[PDB]
């Protein structure tokens, strides 16, 4: 029976609506759900708004009235201007009447805040439509009605707050530029009278709820009003004294004073500088006397989380950091302001100790600003010595692991600056923290890890001599800590921290060969420790030291018989015998970094030969047995060995790039034969078992081999220096091995890595292989488009790699698209428009870029018959496809490139850069300029797509668009104006004449 | 606790949804074989990382058989007649997946040992 | 047991429904099925201070499926605002969701959640995420997919609503499970169902578990 209300042929039963609403808000499971659907269909009924005044009058349920106002809001924001003036005045008067009535009843004002606030927002929606042009007395009457009652005055502060937010804070996306400027100037014109009211309420005092609402509206005003309303009245004094003393007003006052600190203010005026100092002094004095002294444990207070303490302390942090970042120079050169300056910073030190990651980041941004200043600004650091000393301890006790990149970076930068300012104080804190790890008083895994990260972070800041004594001290202490500790858990924790610290001090390692050698041999010993995390940290530390000290492994060190890289390679089997495959790959990668330092070719090739010895021998025995008998691949264990051989080649190619070529040359032929053999096995496995085969460990193993082969080739070609060998030796066998295999597999067996590999090939050597690019298009274009053109979800990897491949082919070898038969070229245009319609931002942005590049490619051809046929066939498809994704609200992330593409297409016609008529003859007089025809075509297209727009709105929009097709920012402004106007009826056509 | 931990391994548990003909994850965390010190009965007890909510709670019945999944070399599927993770004892087709083939084989070995203890 | 209404808001496709479903059933839904208006689900946690129940109002982020919009926020006691760190527009819209929420719910604990931190190519960088500071919102990086910080929003809201900062999620004791006898009449039934399940692949076979 609930579905009664959806029957609009019968008058609405208010008692039934009130039941539905109650069922939705207070009911459960199936009952709630059904009410939900009925309420939604009611609210979305386009005539439902006619029921609102009946519901507001006769409903008992404040939830019904709320939903009634939602319905009214949809009317007011979308279709208001269809209503006769009499009806608009009727609705306006009903809304004002309902607000005043609810405010005059003390019980309803207390208990119905939801409904009153929603009523106030509905009124503001009407002001946006009607005010001031059709309601000049609104502000005078609001000011007047405010003296009649404390409830009405308080509610009028909420209305003015919402009005200010809608006009200055949220207008950007929601109104045309012209309408935003109109409402801003209107509020600006009448502000003097609004301020007079707000000032009187703040002066004449009494009701805390009234005072709080007025300060809430002031916070919004401070975003836009001129400084003189703050600095040339008593208001600064009231905010910084009276309103900081009482806790009801304290939170909002602090947020007001934060925005006061952000006001645009004259820079060269002693009275203003004194007033800026005075409100800070008054605020901090009220904090110290009414809230907590400078010494208070805010860590403890915050933790205890009593009442609004957490928000108050967040707001204090925001106020101090904002004010001091702008004004601390006001406090620095006057002896009588020194205590105020240091107390404000002392509050920040206490706030910095609170355990609350996001608050800590706020204070850390301020400390970064301060210590950066003390590093460069003359005669300042001495002021802040005691503050800086405390901050050293705070940052060191709070150091996070380098894995948390943004927070580690910020913390490191602050600690580096503080170390420069006093290296002795930094060292003393770190050594005495280390001593409290050793004596057990502060011992824990977290605490020794934190300290190790802090010690690591300041590498390179001390003099080489100071660093030498500091690093030795720290390593001796950590070694003692290790010995002293019992059980492998504890020893492994300290051992990881020793590895971490040594890895962060390359300058020390590069100066002390004996030390470096010992470190490496110790890392090799730890590569035999199966205790969790030790092997990974030994491998990570090995590659990190190699990245930084590689030159020391490639020269003969005094009193060594050979370059240390030879010693590593000779013992590689033994060194790596207990590592997991991924650890072996890291190790070989690190060896590749060292070998790339050797600039003698014969010596580099020999070291590369020696490094690849074990994978090359495993490979040779497999290729012998595998070719002698193909069935040997089916073996699970062989597939894993082959994959790990190819992965070892990828690891070493990653670090060696162009230098890897002789190794690639050694395996290339047999690697491509393996690619074909593994392909056949996948094909015949999918035939034998069905698509399910592609989920099996065997077929996933075989496919891994194919993907690592493609990754090896793409890695080499992306870094190759000799492109002649790439084209002459690598490309032809690669294309023969991979393209037909991709084309002739069922969609579910096609590797998207093939597309990725071809992208790199076209990127690096596309200009030199025009026939190769055609072969790539012929093999992958239509079969990949057919996988991805049924929906936006299937084959996400293929989708992304497909548009990256078309993008690079369109940039590098556009001749490949000229070669396509017309039907295939049409599919290319279809594929680009398909990319436009994607929500996934990777595809959409490549889609729009290909479209730009394609237009550029056609423009370049000048006045010839391919270009002329392209425009006649596709210009209007690109204009209308672009407009579709601009106006449908489902593609807002692509806005900028949609606008750029549309501007390009419009400028081609506006400049007369299209030789032929775009219209087919007898559609317009034969003289007709393409400009006149484009105007007409767009007028017609926009009228059909948006029938609620007037002819005038569309003509004005298109007039503005064609004039502004050389000025992107203004063009984008006009497009945004149009996107606001399509969402409502009766948009002003003069809005498109907006300037400046 | 009234129970002894015989075996503990990190695992991901799935239940088969016959309607949607798809596996749905039920939780990730420590799968525990717990021997009740009063009855000597061994159960699987599995709790989710961070929430610690129970995702498996059933006796390792002697009538259960661990079967391979076509997709995995580190997973077992078995029918369970009476699991009380979500309350009222329900039947599920479970799949449990481990970090490695070795963990999965060790799990199978321990599950058989528990079946033999539960035959007593 | 105390029950609190929790409203979940944010752009379409940010992971609101996926996150709640993970909390209800443990499952990771890969498909995007846009919410129509709101889905309401009870969610219970066990704490050292007894059970807490959230009545979760998981609202539609897509404008065309918005339903009652702010109608869903009425008498909410807490909220999560969700965005996707892989989609800049979703963070740009956070102030709009916050505006609409606090106009109905003036004084409630709110968590801001940047979802999908599991994705390598992050578009909303840590440095850019500052909107929470002046609004007194708690912020967490989360992944519904990797379970990174997946409990943190609820733990923080529970601490705020119970008013005990040291509240923890606890394990409830696990009842001894029943010993049953396999029914010989449904033995044929179960071999069928086990056949279908052995021959359907487990998802995400490349994950750590
Ligand atoms: O004088 C040298 O040439 C020398 C050579 C190697 C040294 N190390 C560095 C490697 N090392 C180490 C030990 C365990 C793990 C790790 Cl990653 C590294 C401690 C021994 C040290 N370490 S040390 O702290 O400076 C030192 C000084 C004096 C006596 C020592 F026993 C140790 C010195
Ligand atoms: N990679 C990744 N994907 C996620 C994550 N969370 C959710 N997703 C996916 O992203 C999409 C999110 O879908 P939903 O959770 O339905 O989105 P929603 O926010 O409820 O959207 P609306 O209901 O339309 O407002 C689904 O495809 C999820 O599988 C995450 O942490 N990581
Ligand atoms: Cl300054
Ligand atoms: Cl060097
Ligand atoms: Cl409309
Ligand atoms: Mg949803």
- Nearest CA among A408, A389, A585, A588 for reference residue A504: A408
Q: Can you tell me the distance from the alpha carbon of A642 to that of A635, in angstroms, rounded to the nearest whole number?
A: 11
Task: Give me ligand 3 centre to Cα A252, in Å.
Answer: 25
B71 CB neighbours in chain A (<8 A) are 695-697
- How many helices (H) does chain A have, and how many strands (E)? 52, 0
Q: Can you tell me the distance from the alpha carbon of A237 to that of A241, in angstroms, rounded to the nearest whole number?
A: 6
For the Cβ of A498 lying below 6 angstroms from any atom of ligand 1, the answer is yes
Q: Are A142 and A99 in contact (CB under 8 A)?
A: no
10 Å CB burial of residue A253 (0-12, 13-18, 19+) is buried
**3-class DSSP string for A488-523:** HHHHHHHHHHHHHHHHCCHHHHHHCHHHHHHHHHHH
The residues with which C115 forms a beta bridge, in sequence order, are: C84
B72 CB neighbours in chain A (<8 A) are 697
Helices A841-860 and A895-910, interaxial angle, to 10°? 20
Q: How many CB atoms lie within 10 A of CB C72?
A: 25
Longest dimension (CA), chain A: 104
Q: Cβ separation of C174 and B54 shorter than 8 Å?
A: yes
Closest CA in chain A for residue C201: A695
Q: How many CB atoms lie within 10 A of CB C188?
A: 8
Residue B93 touches chain A, beta carbons under 8 Å = no
Residue A722 touches chain C, beta carbons under 8 Å = no
Q: Can you tell me the distance from the alpha carbon of A169 to that of A388, in angstroms, rounded to the nearest whole number?
A: 38
For the Cβ of C30 lying below 6 angstroms from any atom of ligand 2, the answer is yes
DSSP state of A226: -
What residues sit around ligand 6, an ion, with C-beta below 5 angstroms? C 16-17, 35
Give whole-number Cα distances, A528 to A69, A155, A476, A484, A561, in Å. 72, 74, 24, 22, 26
CA-based Rg of chain A, rounded to a whole angstrom? Answer: 37
Please tell me the distance in Å from B10's CA to the nearest CA on chain A. 15
Pocket test for ligand 1, best of A515, A520, A523, A538 (most atoms within 8 A of CB): A515
Query: Range of C8's domain?
Result: 2-209
DSSP state of C22: H
Q: Are A677 and A638 in contact (CB under 8 A)?
A: no
Q: Are A619 and A644 in contact (CB under 8 A)?
A: no
Q: What is the Cα A668 distance to its own chain's centre? A: 41
Task: Give me ligand 6 centre to Cα A415, in Å.
Answer: 44
CA-based Rg of chain C, rounded to a whole angstrom? Answer: 20
* Residue located nearest, by CA, to atom 28 of ligand 2: C30
- Nearest CA among C135, C19, C4, C132 for reference residue C78: C4
Q: Please identify which residue in the block is written with the tokens 């846009």.
A: C34
Backbone angles phi, psi at A217, to 5 degrees: -70, -40
Name residues 57-116 of chain B within 8 A of C (Cβ): 57-59, 61, 63, 67-72, 75, 77, 79, 81-84, 89, 91, 93, 95, 97-99
Task: Give me ligand 3 centre to Cα A324, in Å.
Answer: 7
Backbone angles phi, psi at A916, to 5 degrees: -100, 160
Give whole-number Cα distances, A245 to A231, A241, A256, A276, B24, in Å. 21, 7, 15, 19, 57
User: What strand order describes the sheet that includes C110-115?
Assistant: C38-47, C50-59, C2-10, C78-84, C110-115, C138-141
DSSP state of C57: E
Please tell me the distance in Å from C76's CA to the nearest CA on chain B. 24
Work out whether the CA dihedral A851, A854, A860, A863 comes out positive or negative: negative
- Nearest CA among A45, A21, A18 for reference residue A31: A21
Residue A696 touches chain B, beta carbons under 8 Å = yes
Q: Can you tell me the distance from the alpha carbon of A249 to that of A261, in angstroms, rounded to the nearest whole number?
A: 18
* Residue located nearest, by CA, to atom 26 of ligand 2: C32
Q: Cβ separation of C171 and B47 shorter than 8 Å?
A: yes
Q: Can you tell me the distance from the alpha carbon of A981 to that of A959, in angstroms, rounded to the nearest whole number?
A: 16
DSSP state of B3: E
Spatial neighbors of A570 by CB under 8 A, at least 6 apart, are none
Q: Can you tell me the distance from the alpha carbon of A772 to that of A767, in angstroms, rounded to the nearest whole number?
A: 10
Q: Can you tell me the distance from the alpha carbon of A504 to that of A517, in angstroms, rounded to the nearest whole number?
A: 16
Burial profile A768-792: b = 16 or more Cβ within 10 angstroms, e = fewer: bbeebbbbbbebbbeebbebbeeee
Q: Can you tell me the distance from the alpha carbon of A548 to that of A552, in angstroms, rounded to the nearest whole number?
A: 10
Helix (H, G, I), strand (E, B) or coil at C41: strand
- Nearest CA among A860, A787, A788 for reference residue A817: A860
C118 known member of a binding site: yes
C71 known member of a binding site: no
C92 known member of a binding site: no
Q: Please identify which residue in the block is written with the tokens 């190619």.
A: A653
Residue range B1-120 forms a domain whose CATH class is: mainly beta
Q: Can you tell me the distance from the alpha carbon of A590 to that of A651, in angstroms, rounded to the nearest whole number?
A: 9
10 Å CB burial of residue A110 (0-12, 13-18, 19+) is exposed
Q: What is the Cα A119 distance to its own chain's centre? A: 36
Name residues 23-82 of chain B within 8 A of A (Cβ): 70-73
Q: Cβ separation of C165 and A67 shorter than 8 Å?
A: no
Q: Are B103 and B9 in contact (CB under 8 A)?
A: yes
Task: Give me ligand 4 centre to Cα A599, in Å.
Answer: 15
- Nearest CA among A412, A389, A391, A392 for reference residue A400: A412
Task: Quote the tokens at residue A866.
Answer: 């391919």
Q: Can you tell me the distance from the alpha carbon of A80 to that of C156, in angstroms, rounded to the nearest whole number?
A: 43
Closest CA in chain B for residue A694: B71
Q: Cβ separation of A66 and C71 shorter than 8 Å?
A: yes
Domain boundaries, chain B: 1-120
Number of domains in chain C: 1
Work out whether the CA dihedral A116, A121, A122, A126 comes out positive or negative: positive
Chains touching C (3+ CB pairs < 8 Å): A, B
Q: Can you tell me the distance from the alpha carbon of A77 to that of A815, in angstroms, rounded to the nearest whole number?
A: 52
Closest CA in chain B for residue A700: B71
Q: Can you tell me the distance from the alpha carbon of A784 to that of A780, in angstroms, rounded to the nearest whole number?
A: 6
Give whole-number Cα distances, A485 to A438, A439, A493, C147, C158, in Å. 9, 11, 10, 34, 40
A692 CB neighbours in chain B (<8 A) are 70
Name residues 41-60 of chain B within 8 A of C (Cβ): 41, 43, 45, 47-55, 57-59
- Nearest CA among A35, A42, A53 for reference residue A7: A42
Q: Are A847 and A885 in contact (CB under 8 A)?
A: no
Please tell me the distance in Å from C104's CA to the nearest CA on chain A. 6
Q: Can you tell me the distance from the alpha carbon of A383 to that of A376, in angstroms, rounded to the nearest whole number?
A: 14
Q: Which ligand is nearest to the CA of A555?
A: 4
Q: Can you tell me the distance from the alpha carbon of C85 to that of C102, in angstroms, rounded to the nearest whole number?
A: 23
Q: Cβ separation of A314 and C136 shorter than 8 Å?
A: yes
Q: Can you tell me the distance from the alpha carbon of A70 to that of A63, in angstroms, rounded to the nearest whole number?
A: 11
- How many helices (H) does chain C have, and how many strands (E)? 6, 6
Helix (H, G, I), strand (E, B) or coil at C151: coil
Please tell me the distance in Å from A753's CA to the nearest CA on chain B. 21
Q: Are C57 and C7 in contact (CB under 8 A)?
A: yes
CA-based Rg of chain B, rounded to a whole angstrom? Answer: 14
- Nearest CA among A985, A976, A978 for reference residue A956: A978
Backbone angles phi, psi at C32, to 5 degrees: -85, 105
Q: Are strands C50-59 and C38-47 parallel, antiparallel or unpaired?
A: antiparallel
Output the DSSP codes for B59-119.
E--TT---B--TT-SSEEEEEEEEE-SSSS-EEEEEEEE-SSHHHHHHHHHHHHHHHHHHH
For the Cβ of C32 lying below 6 angstroms from any atom of ligand 2, the answer is yes
> Hey, which bits of chain C come out as E strands?
2-10, 38-47, 50-59, 78-84, 110-115, 138-141
Choosing among A23, A31, A40, which should be mutated to test the C contact, i.e. which has the most C CBs within 10 A? A40
Helices A770-788 and A732-744, interaxial angle, to 10°? 20
Q: Please identify which residue in the block is written with the tokens 């240390």.
A: A564
10 Å CB burial of residue A86 (0-12, 13-18, 19+) is exposed
Q: Can you tell me the distance from the alpha carbon of C182 to that of A957, in angstroms, rounded to the nearest whole number?
A: 75
Whole-angstrom distance between the N-terminal and C-terminal Cα of chain B? 22
Output the DSSP codes for A569-634.
HHTHHHHHTTS-HHHHHHHHHHHHHHHHT---HHHHHHHHHHHTHHHHHHHHHHHHHHHH-GGGTT
Q: Are C4 and C56 in contact (CB under 8 A)?
A: no
Q: Can you tell me the distance from the alpha carbon of C108 to that of A706, in angstroms, rounded to the nearest whole number?
A: 55
Q: Can you tell me the distance from the alpha carbon of B14 to that of B95, in angstroms, rounded to the nearest whole number?
A: 5
Q: Are A613 and A620 in contact (CB under 8 A)?
A: no
Q: Can you tell me the distance from the alpha carbon of A432 to that of A990, in angstroms, rounded to the nearest whole number?
A: 73
Q: Let me know the angle formed at the C-alpha of C117 by C111 and C120, rounded to the nearest 5 degrees.
A: 165
C207 known member of a binding site: no
Q: Please identify which residue in the block is written with the tokens 């170390």.
A: A419
Spatial neighbors of A443 by CB under 8 A, at least 6 apart, are A436, A437
Q: Let me know the angle formed at the C-alpha of C164 by C163 and C168, rounded to the nearest 5 degrees.
A: 130
Work out whether the CA dihedral A189, A193, A197, A198 comes out positive or negative: positive
Q: Can you tell me the distance from the alpha carbon of A863 to that of A813, in angstroms, rounded to the nearest whole number?
A: 20
Closest CA in chain B for residue A689: B70
Work out whether the CA dihedral A519, A524, A525, A530 comes out positive or negative: positive
- Nearest CA among A702, A705, A700, A709 for reference residue A669: A709
Residue from the list B55, B91, B95 with its beta carbon closest to the beta carbon of C26: B55
Q: What is the Cα C127 distance to its own chain's centre? A: 24
Give whole-number Cα distances, A685 to A677, A678, A747, C186, C202, in Å. 12, 10, 15, 35, 19
For the Cβ of C39 lying below 6 angstroms from any atom of ligand 2, the answer is no
Q: How many residues does chain C have?
A: 209
Chains touching B (3+ CB pairs < 8 Å): A, C
Please tell me the distance in Å from A522's CA to the nearest CA on chain C. 30
Which ligand 1 atom is nearest residue A523's CA? 17
For the Cβ of C115 lying below 6 angstroms from any atom of ligand 2, the answer is yes
Backbone angles phi, psi at B33, to 5 degrees: -95, 110
For the Cβ of C86 lying below 6 angstroms from any atom of ligand 2, the answer is no
C40 known member of a binding site: no
Q: Let me know the angle formed at the C-alpha of A895 by A891 and A900, rounded to the nearest 5 degrees.
A: 135
Task: Quote the tokens at residue A592.
Answer: 């590749």
Domain boundaries, chain A: 1-995
Helix (H, G, I), strand (E, B) or coil at A66: helix
Q: Can you tell me the distance from the alpha carbon of B65 to that of A369, in angstroms, rounded to the nearest whole number?
A: 65
User: What strand order describes the sheet that includes B54-59?
Assistant: B54-59, B42-47, B22-36, B3-17, B90-97, B75-83
For the Cβ of C66 lying below 6 angstroms from any atom of ligand 2, the answer is no
Helix (H, G, I), strand (E, B) or coil at A754: helix
Give whole-number Cα distances, A299 to A353, A931, C17, in Å. 6, 69, 36
Quick one: CA torsion of A19, A21, A22, A24, rounded to 10 degrees? 120
Give whole-number Cα distances, A901 to A836, A851, A890, A906, in Å. 11, 7, 18, 9
Residue B102 touches chain A, beta carbons under 8 Å = no
Q: Are A595 and A659 in contact (CB under 8 A)?
A: yes
- Nearest CA among A398, A435, A400, A392 for reference residue A417: A392
Burial profile A882-919: b = 16 or more Cβ within 10 angstroms, e = fewer: bbbbbbeeebbbbbebbbbbbbbbbebbbeeebeebbb
Q: Can you tell me the distance from the alpha carbon of A251 to that of A239, in angstroms, rounded to the nearest whole number?
A: 11
Q: Can you tell me the distance from the alpha carbon of A81 to that of A954, in angstroms, rounded to the nearest whole number?
A: 18
Give whole-number Cα distances, A525 to A496, A582, A586, A648, in Å. 13, 18, 16, 22
Q: Cβ separation of C202 and B72 shorter than 8 Å?
A: yes
C144 known member of a binding site: yes
What residues sit around ligand 5, an ion, with C-beta below 5 angstroms? A 78
The residues with which B25 forms a beta bridge, in sequence order, are: B14
Q: Please identify which residue in the block is written with the tokens 């931190």.
A: C117
The stretches of A112-221 forming alpha helices (DSSP H) are 113-130, 138-147, 150-164, 171-174, 177-204, 208-221
> Reported resolution in A?
2.2
The residues with which B56 forms a beta bridge, in sequence order, are: B46
CB half-sphere exposure, A102, CA atoms < 13 A: 25
Q: Can you tell me the distance from the alpha carbon of A677 to that of A689, in angstroms, rounded to the nearest whole number?
A: 18
Q: Can you tell me the distance from the alpha carbon of A469 to that of A586, in angstroms, rounded to the nearest whole number?
A: 32
Residue from the list C37, C64, C86 with its beta carbon closest to the beta carbon of A36: C37
Q: Are A118 and A64 in contact (CB under 8 A)?
A: no
Backbone angles phi, psi at C178, to 5 degrees: -65, 150
Quick one: CA torsion of A840, A845, A848, A850, rounded to 10 degrees? -110
């Amino acid at each position: 029976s609930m579905e009664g209300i959806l029957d609009f042929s019968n008058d609405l039963d208010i008692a039934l609506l009130d039941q539905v609403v109650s069922t939705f808000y207070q009911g459960e499971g199936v009952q709630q759900k059904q009410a939900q659907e009925i309420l939604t269909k009611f609210q979305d009924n386009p005539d439902a708004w006619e029921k609102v005044d009946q519901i507001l009058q006769f409903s008992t349920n404040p939830q019904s009235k709320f939903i009634a106002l939602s319905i009214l809001d949809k009317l007011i924001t979308r279709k208001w201007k269809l209503l006769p003036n009499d009806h608009r005045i009727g609705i306006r008067n009903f809304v004002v009447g309902m607000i005043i009535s609810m405010c005059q009843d003390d019980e309803v004002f207390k208990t119905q805040k939801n409904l009153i606030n929603k009523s106030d927002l509905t009124l503001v929606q009407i002001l946006k439509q009607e005010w001031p042009q059709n309601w000049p007395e609104f502000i005078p009457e609001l000011i007047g009605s405010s003296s009649s009652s404390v409830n009405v005055c308080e509610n009028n502060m909420i209305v003015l707050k919402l009005l200010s937010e809608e006009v200055f804070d949220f207008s950007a996306e929601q109104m045309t530029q012209a309408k935003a400027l109109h409402l801003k100037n209107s509020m600006s014109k009448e502000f003097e009278q609004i301020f007079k009211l707000c000032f009187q309420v703040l002066e004449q005092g009494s009701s805390s709820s009234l005072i709080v609402a007025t300060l809430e509206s002031l916070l919004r005003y401070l975003h836009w009003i001129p400084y003189r309303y703050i600095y040339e009245t008593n208001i600064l004094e009231l905010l910084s004294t009276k309103f900081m003393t009482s806790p009801d007003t304290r939170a909002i006052t602090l947020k007001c004073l934060t925005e006061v600190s952000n006001l645009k203010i004259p820079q060269d005026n002693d009275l203003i500088k004194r007033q800026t100092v005075l409100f800070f002094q008054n605020t901090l004095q009220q904090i110290a006397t009414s809230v907590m002294p400078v010494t208070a444990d805010l860590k403890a207070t915050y933790a205890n989380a009593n009442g609004n303490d957490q928000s108050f302390l967040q707001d204090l942090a925001m106020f101090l950091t904002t004010y001091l970042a702008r004004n601390r120079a006001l406090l620095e050169s006057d002896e009588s302001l020194r205590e105020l300056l240091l107390n404000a910073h002392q509050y920040l030190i206490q706030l910095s100790k609170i355990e609350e990651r996001e608050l800590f980041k706020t204070t850390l941004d301020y400390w970064h600003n301060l210590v950066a200043d003390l590093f460069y600004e003359p005669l300042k650091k001495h002021i802040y010595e005691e503050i800086c000393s405390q901050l050293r301890l705070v940052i060191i006790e709070n150091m996070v692991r380098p894995e948390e990149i943004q927070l580690y970076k910020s913390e490191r930068e602050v600690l580096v600056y503080l170390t420069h300012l006093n290296v002795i104080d930094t060292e003393e804190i770190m050594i005495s923290k280390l001593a409290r790890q050793i004596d057990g008083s502060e011992w824990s895994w977290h605490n020794i890890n934190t300290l190790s990260w802090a010690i690591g972070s300041i590498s390179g800041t001390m003099s080489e001599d100071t660093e030498k004594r500091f690093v030795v001290t720290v390593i001796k202490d950590l070694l003692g800590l290790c010995e002293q500790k019992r059980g492998k858990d504890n020893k492994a924790v300290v051992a990881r921290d020793i590895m971490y610290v040594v890895g962060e001090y390359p300058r020390f390692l590069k100066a002390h060969w004996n030390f470096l050698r010992t470190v490496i041999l110790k890392l090799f010993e730890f590569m035999h420790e199966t205790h969790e995390g030790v092997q990974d940290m030994a491998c990570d530390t090995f590659i990190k030291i190699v990245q930084k000290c590689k030159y020391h492994f490639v020269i003969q060190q005094p009193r060594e018989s050979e370059p240390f890289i030879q010693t590593i390679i000779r013992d590689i089997q033994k060194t790596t015998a207990d590592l997991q495959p991924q650890q072996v790959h890291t190790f070989y990668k690190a060896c590749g970094i060292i070998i790339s330092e050797e600039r003698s070719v014969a010596e580099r090739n020999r070291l590369l030969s020696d490094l690849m010895q074990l994978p090359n021998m495993a490979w040779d025995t497999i290729v012998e047995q595998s070719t002698a008998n193909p069935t040997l691949l089916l073996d699970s264990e062989t597939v894993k060995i082959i994959a790990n051989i190819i992965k070892t080649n990828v690891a070493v190619c990653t670090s060696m790039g162009a230098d890897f070529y002789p190794q690639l040359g050694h395996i290339y032929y047999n690697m491509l034969q393996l690619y074909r053999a593994v392909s056949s096995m996948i094909s015949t496995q999918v035939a034998a078992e069905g698509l399910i085969a592609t989920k099996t460990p065997k077929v996933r193993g075989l496919r891994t081999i194919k993907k690592e082969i493609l990754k090896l080739v793409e890695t080499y070609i992306s870094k190759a220096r000799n492109l002649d060998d790439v084209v002459k030796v690598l490309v032809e066998p690669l294309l023969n091995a991979v393209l037909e295999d991709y084309m002739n597999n069922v969609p579910d067996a096609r590797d998207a890595e093939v597309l990725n590999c071809m992208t790199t090939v076209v990127e690096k050597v596309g200009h030199m292989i025009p026939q190769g690019v055609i072969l790539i298009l012929q093999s992958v274009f239509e079969c990949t488009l057919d996988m991805i053109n049924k929906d936006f979800t299937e084959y996400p990897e293929h989708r992304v790699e497909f548009y990256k491949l078309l993008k690079v082919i369109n940039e590098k070898s556009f001749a490949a698209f000229l070669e396509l038969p017309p039907a295939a070229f049409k599919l290319f245009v279809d594929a680009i428009c398909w990319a436009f319609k994607h929500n996934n931002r990777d595809v959409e942005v490549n889609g729009l870029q290909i479209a730009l590049d394609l237009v550029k490619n056609i423009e370049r051809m000048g006045n010839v018959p391919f270009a002329n046929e392209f425009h006649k066939n596709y210009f209007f498809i690109f204009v209308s496809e672009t407009f579709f994704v601009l106006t449908d609200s489902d593609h807002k992330s692509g806005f900028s490139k949609q606008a750029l593409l549309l501007m390009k297409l419009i400028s081609l016609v506006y400049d007369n850069k299209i030789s032929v008529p775009l219209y087919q003859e007898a559609e317009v007089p034969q003289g007709t300029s393409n400009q006149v025809y484009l105007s007409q075509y767009l007028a017609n297209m926009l009228s059909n797509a948006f029938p609620h727009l007037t002819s005038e709105q569309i003509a004005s929009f298109l007039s503005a668009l064609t004039k502004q097709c050389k000025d992107l920012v203004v063009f984008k402004g006009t497009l945004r104006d149009f996107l606001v106007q399509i969402k409502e009826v009766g948009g002003d056509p003069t809005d498109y004449l907006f300037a400046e | 606790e009234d129970e002894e931990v015989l075996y503990k391994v990190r695992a991901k548990l799935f239940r088969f949804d016959a309607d949607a003909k798809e596996w749905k994850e039920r939780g990730t965390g420590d799968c525990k074989f717990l021997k009740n010190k009063k009855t000597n009965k061994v159960r699987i007890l599995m709790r989710r990382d961070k929430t610690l909510k129970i995702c498996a709670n059933h006796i390792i019945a002697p009538e259960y058989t661990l079967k391979p999944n076509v997709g995995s070399d580190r997973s077992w599927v078995y029918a369970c007649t009476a699991d009380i993770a979500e309350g009222e004892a329900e039947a599920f087709t479970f799949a449990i997946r481990f970090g490695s083939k070795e963990n999965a084989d060790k799990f199978k070995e321990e599950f058989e040992k528990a079946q033999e203890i539960n035959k007593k | 047991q105390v029950q609190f209404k929790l409203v979940l808001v944010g752009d379409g496709g940010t992971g609101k429904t996926t996150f709640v479903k993970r909390h209800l059933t443990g499952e990771f839904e890969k498909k995007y099925v846009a919410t129509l208006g709101v889905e309401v689900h009870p969610l219970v946690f066990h704490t050292n201070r007894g059970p807490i129940k959230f009545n979760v109002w998981d609202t539609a982020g897509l404008e065309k499926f918005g339903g009652l919009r702010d109608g869903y926020y009425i008498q909410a006691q807490c909220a999560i605002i969700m965005f996707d760190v892989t989609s800049r527009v979703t963070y740009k819209n956070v102030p709009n969701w916050h505006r609409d929420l606090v106009r109905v719910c003036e004084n409630i604990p709110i968590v801001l959640c940047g979802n999908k931190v599991d994705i390598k190519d992050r578009k909303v960088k840590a440095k850019s995420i500052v909107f929470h500071r002046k609004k007194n919102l708690q912020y967490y990086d989360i992944s519904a997919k990797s379970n990174y910080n997946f409990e943190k929003p609820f733990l923080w809201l529970a601490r705020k609503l119970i008013g005990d900062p040291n509240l923890e999620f606890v394990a409830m004791p696990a009842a001894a499970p029943p010993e049953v006898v396999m029914d010989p009449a449904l033995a044929a039934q179960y071999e069928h169902d086990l056949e279908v399940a052995q021959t359907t692949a487990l998802p995400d076979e490349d994950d750590d578990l």
